[PDB]
Each structure stands twice: as structure tokens, then as C-alpha cells.
């Protein structure tokens, strides 16, 4: 439950998001989203995990899977769920060991090279990557961070190559 949550939040941060969207007038909608190219990844892997959490937290919201062109989206319009993840992201620094690994696994599953020829994680939020970088060093995986897209300020986290097995070995 702690691992699942951290994992899902890694997926949401990697490629998805937490949104408060306008419905009508001053009413807003609290939407938790996770995008993944592969329909079955969401279908046979991510949905089950979210359903469990959803049910564990007593969110009456249902999961909806929308197919955009090329990619799929998993949505859950829930104020409680949105906030549940909001606080998790606030106290990320207090993440325990099992949560840190889970978080990192979702971050790489979100936008990482499934081929493992390239081991990178990208984010416009440097401060988050650095706390991730420290989590990796702590598990003995060598890694580097450096501004990738300067115009849009997107930093990249690279896992040293002489530590590829170490990474898959530690995050699994």
C-alpha cells in the first residue's frame, strides 16, 4: 500500500498529473491522471494497482480509461485521491526505503528505456531529481544529473552504465 502509492505517484510524476479543472461556473474537478502508450500496461498493470489503492482509501470514484490518439489516459476524478497524492508529494523527503525504490521504479517505468540501453529520467523540477539522485547513490547506483533542455529547463538524470545491472537489481 505504501509501495503501491509511491509507485503510482512515480507514474503520475513521470507522465501524468494532478489537476483541478473547471467544470461549470466556479465548480472545479479534481483529476488524477496517468498516461501510457500501451493500453495493456494501464489495463493489466496500472489500473489494478490504482483500483486497489482507490478501494483501500474508500474513494467511490470509478476509474475511466480514455484513448487519445496514440496514447491512453487513466483518470480518477476524486478530491480525496487528488489530495492523498498531493500530501505524498509534499512529504516525499520523509519517504522510507521501500517507498523510495517504488517511487524510482514508477519514474523509470513512466518515461524510461524498457530496452535499458539508455537509463534516464527527466524532469523540469531539479530539486526532485536531486532527492532521487541521493536515493540512488544510497543504494550504490552511480548517477548524474544535468540540464538537458535549456530553453524549457528540463533536467535529465542519467544512471551510470557501469551500474546497469545494479539499478535493475535494486529497483526489482
89 plus 28 within the same structural domain: yes
Look up residue 159 and give its three cell numbers. Answer: 544512471
41 plus 107 within the same structural domain: no
The full length of the chain comes to 172
CA–CA gap between residue 20 and residue 131 (Å, rounded) = 26
- Closest by alpha carbon to 14, among 143, 121, 170? 121
8 plus 78 within the same structural domain: yes
Residue where one domain finishes, among candidates 60, 95, 130 = 95
Domain that holds residue 17: 1-95
Q: DSSP of the chain, one letter per residue?
A: -HHHHHHHHHHHHHSEEEEEEE-STT-EEEEEEEEES-HHHIIIIIHHHHHHHHHHTT--PPPEEEE-SS-EEEEEE-HHHHHHHHHHTTSGGG--HHHHHHHHHHHHHHHS-TT-SS-EEEES-HHHHHHHHHHHHHTT--EEEEEEETTTTEEEEEE-GGGHHHHHHHH-
CA–CA–CA angle 48, 166, 41 (5° rounding): 20
CATH number for the domain that contains residue 121: 3.10.28.10
Name residues whose C-beta falls within 8 Å of residue 127's C-beta, 6 or more positions apart in sequence: none
Residue where one domain finishes, among candidates 95, 125, 153 = 95
CB atoms within 10 A of CB 29: 15
Structural domains of the chain, count: 2
User: Helices 47-56 and 2-14 meet at what angle, rounded to 10?
Assistant: 130
Residue 20 contacts residue 30 (beta carbons within 8 Å):
yes
Burial (CB < 10 A; 0-12, 13-18, 19+), residue 154, is: middle
15 classed as catalytic: yes
Residue 15 contacts residue 34 (beta carbons within 8 Å):
yes
148 classed as catalytic: no
Q: Which of 29, 39, 73, 111 is catalytic?
A: 111
Q: Which of 15, 55, 69, 113 is catalytic?
A: 15
50 plus 109 within the same structural domain: no
30 plus 17 within the same structural domain: yes
Residue where one domain finishes, among candidates 95, 111, 143 = 95
67 plus 5 within the same structural domain: yes
CA–CA gap between residue 172 and residue 168 (Å, rounded) = 6
35 plus 84 within the same structural domain: yes
9 plus 71 within the same structural domain: yes
Residue 7 contacts residue 106 (beta carbons within 8 Å):
yes
SS3 annotation, 117-131: CCCEEEECCHHHHHH
35 plus 119 within the same structural domain: no
104 plus 87 within the same structural domain: no
- Closest by alpha carbon to 31, among 79, 88, 85, 90? 79
CA–CA gap between residue 125 and residue 155 (Å, rounded) = 7
63 plus 85 within the same structural domain: yes
Burial (CB < 10 A; 0-12, 13-18, 19+), residue 1, is: exposed
91 plus 103 within the same structural domain: no
Amino acid at each position: 500500500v505504501s509501495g503501491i502509492s509511491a509507485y503510482l505517484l512515480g507514474l503520475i510524476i513521470g507522465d501524468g498529473g494532478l489537476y483541478k479543472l473547471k467544470y461549470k461556473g466556479n465548480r472545479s474537478e479534481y483529476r488524477v491522471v496517468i498516461t501510457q502508450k500501451s493500453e495493456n500496461l494501464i489495463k493489466q498493470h496500472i489500473a489494478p494497482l490504482m483500483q486497489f489503492l482507490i478501494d483501500e482509501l474508500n474513494v467511490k470514484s470509478k476509474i475511466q480509461i480514455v484513448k487519445g490518439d496514440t496514447r491512453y489516459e487513466l483518470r480518477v476524478s476524486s478530491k480525496k485521491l487528488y489530495y492523498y497524492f498531493a500530501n505524498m508529494l509534499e512529504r516525499i523527503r520523509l519517504f522510507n526505503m521501500r517507498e523510495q525504490i517504488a517511487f524510482i521504479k514508477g519514474l523509470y517505468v513512466a518515461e524510461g528505456d524498457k530496452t535499458l540501453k539508455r537509463l534516464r529520467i527527466w524532469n523540469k523540477n531539479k530539486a526532485l531529481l536531486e532527492i532521487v539522485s541521493r536515493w540512488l547513490n544510497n543504494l550504490g547506483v552511480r548517477n548524474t544529473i544535468h540540464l538537458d533542455d535549456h530553453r524549457h529547463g528540463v533536467y535529465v538524470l542519467n544512471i551510470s552504465l557501469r551500474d546497469r545491472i545494479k539499478f535493475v537489481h535494486t529497483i526489482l
